[PDB]
Every structure is written in C-alpha cells, then in structure tokens.
C-alpha cells in the first residue's frame, strides 16, 4: 500500500513536469475561415488545435495521401476545453462542420518522428506489466 | 436524422424492364421473318430504401429525461483579487 501511493505521486509529478520537447508551427490553412482555429501545432506525437471562446468545436478528420478521409481518436484538454488534440501528426488535416469544410496543411511533416519507447504520452513514465504470468 | 437517399430504382425495376424489352424484341424478330415481368417485379419491388448521411453535419439531441449532477459537482467562491 505504501508503494503504489508513492508511485502514483511520482507519476503525476512526472506528467506535470512536461519538459524537453520541440514544437512545430509550420501550418497553413485553406478554405473556410469561419471555422478557423486560432492556433495549431504539434509536439511530435500529438497535434493540437485551439479555438477561441465563441466558436463551436468542429470535427477533425485524417487525410491519407490519396485524398480520402478517415477517423482518428481525439481528446479535449485545457482549462477551458478549447484545445482538441488528435493522436497523430500528419501532413494534411481536414476540418468540417455541416456544409463548411476547412483543410489544414502540415507543411513541416516529419516522417521520422520520435519513437515512443516509454509506452505513455510523455517520455518520463514507463508502463510495466502487472499481470505477470 | 436524415439526408440524401438511395431508392435503389434500378435493382428494383430492372428485372421487369429487361424481361419486357427482350421479350418484345424477340417477338418483333419472330414476326420479322417475312407473366415473367410480373413474376420478377413481385420479388424485386419491396427493397427498403437506404439512407446516407454526410459526416460532419450538425445534429441535436432532445434531452428526453431530466439529468441530475448532484453527485459530481459542487460550487465554491473564489477570493477577490
């Protein structure tokens, strides 16, 4: 009982540390600007969009090389839930809301990326197998 | 929810159309020397229509039963300045 409590405290501290990362801002947008996010970037593992307070949160779609769209998991983070984060970095993002469509170009695409050995969203925490067997 | 529809017109009436037209052409050819359509349409007529809704369209949810949050939230004042 003593052990996992200290472990949890350490894990939460490690997550809130959030240090040692690079941030991309080479992003261009085309089409509808009324669904325009105010900022977009990526940390090499996640891609972030930020919307102002007065706009509706659209749906985010993944574009392959060919041009077809597809789904990606998304999560929302932030003090005011005004950042939507997707689980990939990709050259071309598509944003839709009703019959307004907006395209986002990732113009600094990194095919290499940073491999995720630690098994989490941050390189500070591992993921160990309790189940054993 | 609703959007654009496919009524499957062809794979509903093609049987009757083809049978009738081919039978008529054959009869014309036979005369040029000098019912199945009903049976088909009977089975091909009642194919339910299919709905295709474009993704990313706005929708609304009519809250059909009252929602209680007394178990998950509480409010507190914040200090001035």
């Amino acid at each position: 009982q003593t052990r996992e409590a200290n472990a949890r405290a350490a894990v939460e501290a490690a997550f809130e540390q959030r240090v040692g990362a690079y941030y991309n801002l080479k992003y261009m947008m085309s089409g509808d600007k009324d669904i325009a996010p105010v900022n977009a970037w990526d940390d090499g593992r996640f891609t972030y969009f930020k919307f102002s307070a007065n706009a509706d949160l659209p749906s985010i779609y993944f574009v392959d090389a060919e041009g077809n769209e597809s789904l990606v998991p998304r999560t929302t983070v932030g003090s005011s839930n005004n950042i939507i984060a997707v689980h990939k970095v990709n050259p071309k993002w598509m944003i839709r809301l009703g019959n307004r469509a907006l395209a986002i170009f990732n113009e600094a695409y990194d095919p290499n990326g940073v491999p995720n050995d630690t098994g989490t969203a941050s390189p500070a925490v591992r993921r160990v197998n309790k189940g054993g067997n | 929810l609703g959007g654009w529809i496919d009524r499957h017109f062809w794979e509903r009436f093609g049987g009757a159309i083809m049978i009738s037209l081919i039978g008529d052409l054959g009869d014309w050819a036979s005369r040029q020397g000098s019912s199945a359509a009903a049976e088909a349409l009977r089975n091909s007529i009642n194919i339910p229509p299919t709905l295709y809704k474009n993704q990313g369209e706005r929708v609304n949810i009519l809250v059909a039963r009252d929602l209680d949050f007394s178990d998950v939230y509480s409010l507190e004042s914040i200090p001035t300045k």
């Binding site: 992003y27 105010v38 395209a103 | 474009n54």
Partner: peptide, 28 residues
C-alpha cells in the same frame, strides 16, 4: 447512375498560415 453526394471539398486558393501569433500554452 446516381450515388451519394461527396462532402464539400474546400477551396485550395486561400492558403495562409494558421498561427497569426505564437500559441500561449507553449509558454511563449
């Protein structure tokens, strides 16, 4: 002969950078 309409394909002319300003949560 007729099939589902494709969603609106955005225009590809108005291409501008999205970050007019540096985002805040980067602490920048």
């Amino acid at each position: 002969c007729a099939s589902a309409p494709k969603p609106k394909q955005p225009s590809d002319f108005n291409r501008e950078p999205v970050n007019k300003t540096v985002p805040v949560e980067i602490q920048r």
